[PDB]
Amino acid sequence: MNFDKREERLGTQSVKWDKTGELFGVTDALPMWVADMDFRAPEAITEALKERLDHGIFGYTTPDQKTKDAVCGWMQNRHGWKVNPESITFSPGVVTALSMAVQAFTEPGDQVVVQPPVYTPFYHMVEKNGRHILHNPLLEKDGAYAIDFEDLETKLSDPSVTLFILCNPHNPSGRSWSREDLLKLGELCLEHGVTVVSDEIHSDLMLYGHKHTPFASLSDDFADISVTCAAPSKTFNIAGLQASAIIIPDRLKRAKFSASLQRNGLGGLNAFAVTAIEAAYSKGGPWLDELITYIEKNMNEAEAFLSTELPKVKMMKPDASYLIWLDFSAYGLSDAELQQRMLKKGKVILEPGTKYGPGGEGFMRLNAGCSLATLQDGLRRIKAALS
Amino acid sequence: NFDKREERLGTQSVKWDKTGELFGVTDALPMWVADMDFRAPEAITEALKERLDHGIFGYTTPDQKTKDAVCGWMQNRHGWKVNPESITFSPGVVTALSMAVQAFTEPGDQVVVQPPVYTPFYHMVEKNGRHILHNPLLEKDGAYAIDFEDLETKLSDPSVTLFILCNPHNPSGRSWSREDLLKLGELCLEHGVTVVSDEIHSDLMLYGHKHTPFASLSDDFADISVTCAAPSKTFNIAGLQASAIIIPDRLKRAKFSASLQRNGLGGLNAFAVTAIEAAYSKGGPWLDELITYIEKNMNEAEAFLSTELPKVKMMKPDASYLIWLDFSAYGLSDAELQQRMLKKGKVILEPGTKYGPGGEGFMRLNAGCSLATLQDGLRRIKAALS
Ligand SMILES: *Cc1c(COP(=O)(O)O)cnc(C)c1O
Ligand SMILES: *Cc1c(COP(=O)(O)O)cnc(C)c1O
């Protein structure tokens, strides 16, 4: 493949490139914010979409035995994890699945534990459904995030806590939790009667031979209290297609999740979604393995550059994915001022760290899912941003 | 060109590939679920190729020119002025109905519908802890009419908060008159009921029938209505999951958005964003060519039914490609009618059962197909009835 190839994305109705005016107040800044890549989907996906377009009929389209086998086959090949086809419910996206899972496995007024800072919709899919966020803040220990197990046990044992949403890899930072972290979390959740939603959407994008451990893979018991959200969207840059496989080995939990879909008038995938998730999990491998190497070399360049040129900026090197959580605390600036210096003076758009709630103060997130050249330009824009 | 023979077996089509699971047969001609056996308009497939060639499928959002396409259609096809601020995108009309029910009622509230009607109307009320209240349709002159005296009684009940209008009405394809709609609006305005109008059959007006959007009739009506429109039935693209929901009243639009956010919805897929624009922008003449082919298909059905199966009363539909067929005069049970159709004739209709009360003795025949496929359908219906 050829990730250095320069793409024009202006005028493609791209949220990342075309909605900067609406969302940031600038038209002339390099977009490096929302988590989508600047790359063409693999040819293995587009071949098969063009094939679906050629048939020319776009009526009611359903996933089938071969769609499920591509999901199962992929999880066994990439992650060593056995999934029965029957475990899989499709969804138009993982944020939808987060919402459905909240509605299915908790009551109005329950508490849901998350580990902040974290992906913003975790807050929204709990708060907007009249459930309550209880935070288990992560600890910064040695330029990497660690889980605080003493706080978690205190939080998980309150009787109104019925759900825990795990982000693994964690967004932001790209932290890949250890087997032992998951085992400790799992046992606490069994003990305290807490269903686990595992958001594993970044889990294919593992850097430097970091190993992903799907929570549900660890025991029967874990499998029976888990809802794993997986998707080709981050892995193959096809968020645009609204395709998710949600894995729920417990029949009763699956039926409750399905019921939430039915109630809200959902359960269909669009016809392109159905082609895309079969092609992606069938023939995506080789392209992913070239993307990892490409992202590794992008991450080595950002680390090289910041530690040399910007020594007050502290970069968490991610274990996975193409998003870099960056610490600008040392500059003593408001989040309001940091962002204006990036927007007006560097001409670059990063995600402001306050988006991710407590612990996001003084950080911003940088989308390194672009050609080396675009990354080098953006790094220079961050330096420029700071006098 | 609608006479081209089109292969749909092996294409993950619910209609053609899910018969074994849903009807217990794989050797029958499927003429049940409401999608067509035709290629979409070239105006949509050509714009789809453009987005495919660009080769990147990240987060894609509707823009002003998407909402303009929608306002262009409603102005050009209907004479309805729609401000872009009024449009909220949804992945589907069933999704919209669920959202409307959750946004505009309380649990325990009663929701009026006119049976027999599209099955999801019942599910999206009952499954959400709301109560279906029937305003049954009367058969008069072999066509449906509204029972306004019964309707007035029911809209008066104070726990009734929502009316779900099907216009055109599935099943039957009935296109409600200006007069019908003015009287319905008056009652809901009188009794503080919110009107959800499913208008998804509204662009396939046959034989000079004219669709009247509820919302178009006055500011009073606009402001209590939720209009669910889509290109999906009109252009055979239900599998691109695109729809446009028109809420002129800003407060009800806010509550409807809030139901979409709450459910982690709001986004359209990249192809839907393309498809809805192209369809409402450039689909006009392909649709006129389709109205004409449907009209021929209906004429053939009426001619064949009046001559070869005169016991069958066809409701000639005002709109869409779905034929509501009364098999009463045969005296088979609903269950024997379906086993005869599926096992003897080896053809699949929608059993009128599923549409609720007023549905017994009926089945719905899908004529959205080549005249050849329809003639094979009618031949199999006659074989089933011997
Ligand atoms: C980007 C992202 C998502 C997005 O899910 P969709 O399927 O695109 O709705 C969900 N979770 C995490 C952690 C993400 O980073
Ligand atoms: C087919 C049909 C629908 C389904 O709409 P989607 O866009 O597929 O959700 C809704 N309403 C009526 C009356 C229909 O006939």
Author numbering:
A (entry chain A): 1 to 387
B (entry chain D): 2 to 387
Please give sentences taken from the publication describing this entry.
Once inside the cell the terminal glycine is cleaved by a dipeptidase (PepA) to release Cys-3M3SH (2), which is metabolised by a C-S β-lyase liberating volatile 3M3SH (3), which diffuses or is exported out of the cell (4). While the PatB enzymes are poorly characterised and the genes are not associated with amino acid metabolism gene clusters or operons, the orthologues from B. subtilis (PatB) and Escherichia coli (MalY) are known to have cystathionine β-lyase activity, suggesting that these enzymes might also be capable of Cys-3M3SH cleavage. ShPatB and BsPatB are homodimeric with each subunit containing a PLP moiety covalently bound to a conserved lysine residue in the catalytic site (Lys246 and Lys234 in ShPatB and BsPatB, respectively) in what is termed the internal aldimine state. In the course of a typical PLP-DE catalysed reaction, upon substrate binding, the ε-amino group of the amino acid substrate displaces the lysine residue from the PLP to form an external aldimine.
The PatB enzymes from non-axillary microbes B. subtilis (BsPatB) and Streptococcus anginosus (SaPatB) did not discriminate between the two ligands, while the enzymes from Corynebacterium jeikeium (CjAecD) and E. coli MalY (EcMalY) had higher activities against cystathionine, similar to the MetC enzymes included (ShMetC and SeMetC), which have little or no activity against Cys-3M3SH. In contrast to ShPatB, the BsPatB binding cavity is more solvent exposed and composed of charged residues, thus enabling the binding of polar substrates like cystathionine and the hydroxyl group of the 3M3SH moiety of Cys-3M3SH.
